[PDB]
Amino acid sequence: YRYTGKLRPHYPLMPTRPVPSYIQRPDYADHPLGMSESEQALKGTSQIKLLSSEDIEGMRLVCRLAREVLDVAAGMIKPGVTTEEIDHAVHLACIARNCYPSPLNYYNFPKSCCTSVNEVICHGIPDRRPLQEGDIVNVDITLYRNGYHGDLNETFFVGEVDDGARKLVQTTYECLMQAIDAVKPGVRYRELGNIIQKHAQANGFSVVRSYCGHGIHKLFHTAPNVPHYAKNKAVGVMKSGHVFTIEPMICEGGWQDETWPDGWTAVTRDGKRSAQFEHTLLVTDTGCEILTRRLDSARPHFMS
Q: Looking at 100, 264, 277, 302, which residue binds ligand EYL (CB under 6 A)?
A: 264
Q: Does 116 bind Na ion (CB under 5 A)?
A: yes
Is 123 marked within a binding site? yes
Is 151 marked within a binding site? yes
Is 214 marked within a binding site? yes
Is 71 marked within a binding site? no
What's the min distance (Å) between Cβ of 265 and ligand EYL? 9
41-45 long-range Cβ contacts below 8 angstroms, 24+ apart: 42/219, 42/222, 42/223, 45/223
Residue 59: φ, ψ to 5°:
-75, -45
Q: Looking at 84, 87, 127, 140, which residue binds Co ion (CB under 5 A)?
A: 140
Torsion region of 204: left, alpha or beta (phi above 0 gives left; psi -120 to 50 gives alpha) = left
What's the min distance (Å) between Cβ of 251 and Na ion? 9
Asked if 139 and 204 count as a contact pair (C-beta separation under 8 A), the reply is no
CA distance 39 to 255: 28
- Sign of the C-alpha dihedral computed for residues 147, 29, 291 and 242 taken in this order: negative
274 binds, among Co ion, ligand EYL, Na ion, none (CB under 5 to 8 A by kind): Na ion
Q: Where are the alpha helices (DSSP H) in the chain?
A: 37-41, 53-75, 83-96, 163-182, 191-202
Which residue lies nearer to Na ion by CB, 197 or 274? 274
List the binding residues for a protein. 123, 221
Query: Which residues bind to ligand EYL, rule: CB under 6 A?
Result: 103, 106-107, 109, 114, 123, 140, 142, 151, 247, 264, 278
Residue list for the binding site for Zn(2+): 140, 151, 214, 247, 278
